[PDB]
């Protein structure tokens, strides 16, 4: 098998060994694409993913490599953004960005601030009760969004009743 991904005019993609880097007006993302007998190479205007095998396990990764690359194309041009909404019922939850980590205070009345560190070059811009996680590395952005939501996780009590927390409102 072999698949050819024509790279966008807006982008440049270089690759040495098992590492591929993609640079666009929005940034640069480098990934490792390592799997038995699957070669990834930049042939001038197109990135090539090929292998001499066609077994289910191989095809699976090939398809995965593809989406991973295309996702990088998209991240260096249009970028990736996740929209989130802080929400509380009794205690005013305060979500702030301090340093390279978003901090949340007064969660359900907690005295101890809950926090999480942002992944990579992900921007977490907060405006009122709305948050916007964005960056060129979908991996990083996606996690930072997630981590933020996970950060208000509650196991001790009935979630249906204690719904406070920040949630992913719009997935790219």
């Amino acid at each position: 098998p072999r698949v050819e991904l024509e790279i966008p005019e807006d982008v440049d993609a270089e690759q040495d060994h098992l590492d591929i880097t993609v640079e666009g007006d929005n940034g640069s993302v480098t990934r490792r694409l390592w799997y038995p007998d699957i070669d990834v190479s930049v042939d001038g205007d197109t990135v090539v993913i090929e292998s001499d095998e066609d077994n289910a396990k191989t095809m699976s990764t090939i398809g995965t490599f593809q989406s991973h690359i295309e996702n990088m194309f998209h991240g260096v041009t249009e970028g990736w953004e996740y929209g989130m909404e802080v929400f509380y019922s009794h205690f005013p939850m305060q979500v702030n960005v301090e340093g390279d980590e978003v901090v949340i205070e007064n969660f359900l009345g907690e005295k101890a601030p809950r926090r999480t560190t942002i992944h990579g070059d992900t921007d977490v811009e907060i405006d009122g009760e709305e948050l916007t996680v964005s960056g060129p590395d979908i991996e990083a952005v996606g996690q930072t969004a997630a981590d933020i939501e996970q950060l208000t996780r509650i196991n001790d009590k009935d979630v249906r009743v204690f719904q406070d927390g920040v949630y992913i409102t719009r997935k790219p």
């Binding site: 390592w34 799997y35 038995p36 007998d37």
Partner: protein
């Protein structure tokens, strides 16, 4: 310090067992061997199981004792000893004329023995002796 090796073998990206089997055979033929870059030697398989085996060996023991190495240094050497009759005169001689090293203290670059190299491009399930030692608790002195 200073070891007149008739042969210097480079373990980097080689199957430990296959290297050892050959280093054993040569030492018994009278050759003085030195294994280099042990920390970069490799063993195929699911890292989770592999590590369980070596962790078990560390835990095994009693007053009589079962001293099992944690550094990629000894791990490799113990592997070789298992392929020599180290309790016989001949065996102990052969074993003692073989030493394993972390990295390469020589000037010459060791040679790669046939059939012992692992192609990283067509293999994802394998582990580095160094990785194992770090898991075991060794002090990464390399």
């Amino acid at each position: 310090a200073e070891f007149d090796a008739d042969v210097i073998v480079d373990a980097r990206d080689c199957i430990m067992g296959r290297v050892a089997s050959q280093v054993a055979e040569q030492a018994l033929d009278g050759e003085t061997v030195a294994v280099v870059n042990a920390e970069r030697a490799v063993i195929t398989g699911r890292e989770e199981q592999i590590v369980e085996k070596y962790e078990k060996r560390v835990d095994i023991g009693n007053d009589n004792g079962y001293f099992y190495p944690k550094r990629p240094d000894g791990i490799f050497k113990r592997t070789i000893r298992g392929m020599l009759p180290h309790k016989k005169q001949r065996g102990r001689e052969a074993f003692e004329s073989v030493r394993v090293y972390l990295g390469n203290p020589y000037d010459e670059d060791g040679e790669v023995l046939d059939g012992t190299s692992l192609d990283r491009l067509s293999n994802i399930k394998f582990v580095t002796l160094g990785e194992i030692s770090e898991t075991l608790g060794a002090n990464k002195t390399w």
